[PDB]
Amino acid sequence: CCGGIKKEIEAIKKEQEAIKKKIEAIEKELSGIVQQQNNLLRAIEAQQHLLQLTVWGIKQLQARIL
């Protein structure tokens, strides 16, 4: 039984605390992405709108001709 608790608790507690912050860091980077992921969405929607705007713009010019 005992004797070997000396070599285990003072071993796989530190590496299992090397997880209890190497995860507590990720939870920033995840939402560091949703930060970016959302700006991206915002960016595309801006282009998408300019596109429709320019298509019409072209239809109007094309119409001015012929």
Epitope: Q52, W56, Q60
Partner: antibody
Framework: QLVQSGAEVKKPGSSVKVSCKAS????????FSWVRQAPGQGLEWMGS????????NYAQKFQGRVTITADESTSTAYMELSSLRSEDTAVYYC??????????????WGQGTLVTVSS | IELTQPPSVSVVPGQTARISCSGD??????ASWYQQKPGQAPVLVIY???NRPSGIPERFSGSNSGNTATLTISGTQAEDEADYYC???????????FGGGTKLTVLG
Amino acid sequence: QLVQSGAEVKKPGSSVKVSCKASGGTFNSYAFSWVRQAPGQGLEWMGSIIPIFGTTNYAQKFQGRVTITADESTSTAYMELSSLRSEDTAVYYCARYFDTYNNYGFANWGQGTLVTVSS
Amino acid sequence: IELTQPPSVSVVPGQTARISCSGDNIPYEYASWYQQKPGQAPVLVIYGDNNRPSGIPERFSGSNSGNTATLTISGTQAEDEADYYCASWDSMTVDGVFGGGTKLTVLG
């Protein structure tokens, strides 16, 4: 959102500008049309402009008589009809489309401008 | 391109009301419906593929079928008594075009 110039009286054969100030929002993202209504009658579409290029297109009935322009500095659209005759007496509306990309509908309107062409 | 509505349409309080816009070189996502009460700017009620703008009541729906737009009010009201217009754009010319309007009557 959209507010227009006040009501007018014009001699026949003369002309008139009408203005429309689009408040709060990006003027380059807008598309605008003028739509007039004769008393107790239907709406009739006159022309459109896209401010960010200033490309306009007009309904044939009014082609020659009507000009539409915009001024980004002041966020304003203008329509100007010349060689006025009685049938032009109408309420003139200013309308914004492309509120969103898939929306070809006129989501916002002016309060209207009554124009009266009597001698 | 030109649009065609029934000049008026009357209905019993709390029924389905149907205005039809018709013709001719088709829309579809270009088509819009508007309600105008006396002495007021039109208010967009339906646009494209059966879409309500914000704060618009669900009794309003947009229908479509080839040549034809149909605005449809479920369980009408007295306040729904108004003049209605359909509008769309000619894909060639990009001209805007309105129907001649339809006086929805709930006269009693």
